[PDB]
């Protein structure tokens, strides 16, 4: 394995950050195509892109960095909010 495509890089970085969850019921994230993800208990699909090496998640009309999205949504990260 060699990360080469944007889809590959995004998926690796989503994996790295989601793996930091400490919840009893882990915050689940699934790749649904090269550019859409399902996060946590929400069934909503979100676009995900990489821009200058930062992964961003589509949220209400704009883009939010992945780390901030996880702070806002993964219960074990709420103390960063
Ligand atoms: Ni968590």
Residue numbers in the entry: 18 to 98
Share the article's original sentences.
ACF7 belongs to the evolutionarily conserved spectraplakin family of proteins. ACF7 is a key crosslinker of microtubule and F-actin networks. The carboxy terminus of ACF7 contains the GAR domain, which is responsible for microtubule binding. In this study, we demonstrated that ACF7 can promote microtubule association with tight junctions in intestinal epithelial cells, and disruption of the microtubule network or deletion of ACF7 inhibits tight junction dynamics and impairs intestinal wound repair, suggesting that the dynamics of cell/cell junctions and focal adhesions may be regulated via similar mechanisms, involving spectraplakin-mediated cytoskeletal coordination.
To address this issue, we isolated the ACF7-GAR protein and resolved its X-ray structure. The resulting experimental electron density maps revealed that the asymmetric unit of the ACF7-GAR crystal consists of one protomer. The crystal structure of ACF7-GAR was determined to a resolution of 1.5 Å, revealing that the ACF7-NT molecule is folded into an elongated polypeptide that is ∼32.7 Å long and ∼17.9 Å wide. There is one α-helix at the amino terminus (α1), followed by five antiparallel β-strands (β1, β2, β3, β4 and β5), folding into a central β-sheet from which a flexible β-hairpin structure with a positively charged surface extrudes, and another C-terminal α-helix (α2). These features are interconnected with flexible coil loops. The microtubules have highly negatively charged surface. Thus, it is most likely that the GAR domain binds microtubules through the flexible, positively charged central β-sheet. To test our hypothesis, we mutated five positively charged amino acids at β2, β3, β4, K53, R63, R66, R69 and R75 to aromatic residues K53Y, R63Y, R66Y, R69Y and R75Y. Our results indicate that the mutation in the five residues almost completely inhibits microtubule binding with ACF7’s GAR domain. By contrast, expression of ACF7 mutant failed to rescue the dynamic feature of tight junctions in vitro or cell motility, strongly suggesting that ACF7 regulates these processes through its interaction with microtubule network.
